[PDB]
Amino acid sequence: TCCPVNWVEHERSCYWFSRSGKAWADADNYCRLEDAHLVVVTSWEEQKFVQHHIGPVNTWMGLHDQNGPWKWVDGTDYETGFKNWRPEQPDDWYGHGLGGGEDCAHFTDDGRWNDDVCQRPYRWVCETEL
Numbered sequence: 001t002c003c004p005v006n007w008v009e010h011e012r013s014c015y016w017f018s019r020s021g022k023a024w025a026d027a028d029n030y031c032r033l034e035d036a037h038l039v040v041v042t043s044w045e046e047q048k049f050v051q052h053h054i055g056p057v058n059t060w061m062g063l064h065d066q067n068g069p070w071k072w073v074d075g076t077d078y079e080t081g082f083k084n085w086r087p088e089q090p091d092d093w094y095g096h097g098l099g100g101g102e103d104c105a106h107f108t109d110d111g112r113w114n115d116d117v118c119q120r121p122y123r124w125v126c127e128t129e130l
């Protein structure tokens with residue numbers, strides 16, 4: 001009863017799943033304007049719940065290394081926290097030829113994470129805490 005309309009409640013958090021794509025910085029701005037942040041996944045249980053609602057689609061999360069080390073957007077510690085990288089990721093790939101490596105994390109079609117080019121338009125998930 002405390003999540004906004006069209007948001008999904010799960011373990012004291014509210015989630016909004018986009019049905020359109022945006023570059024990471026744009027999806028980040030979108031979530032912030034809803035008094036929310038790009039989804040911060042801290043457990044296997046929260047990972048399975050997000051997977052259920054996104055399906056087999058590349059989807060941005062609130063994890064990036066644009067300024068150096070890996071950081072979650074709300075300040076949640078990366079080093080000591082949950083990780084679900086696909087084997088061989090993050091790899092900071094430059095071979096896409098678009099400039100730079102790969103600095104934004106997204107869920108891949110099977111749920112496991114990948115670092116990709118932040119400019120790519122992907123769907124995204126916003127999260128707010130109750």
Ligand SMILES: O=c1[nH]cnc2c1ncn2[C@@H]1O[C@H](COP(=O)(O)O)[C@@H](O)[C@H]1O
Nearest residue numbers: 058089091093095102108109114115116
């Ligand atoms: O041609 C390639 N060479 C090396 N790695 C690649 C190549 N294409 C894609 N990748 C890797 O695969 C990731 C994309 O994962 P996907 O979007 O699930 O296919 C990229 O971010 C790179 O890590």
Ligand SMILES: [Ca+2]
Nearest residue numbers: 013040041042
């Ligand atoms: Ca969370």
Ligand SMILES: [Ca+2]
Nearest residue numbers: 065092102103
């Ligand atoms: Ca990087």
Ligand SMILES: [Ca+2]
Nearest residue numbers: 091102114115
């Ligand atoms: Ca990658």
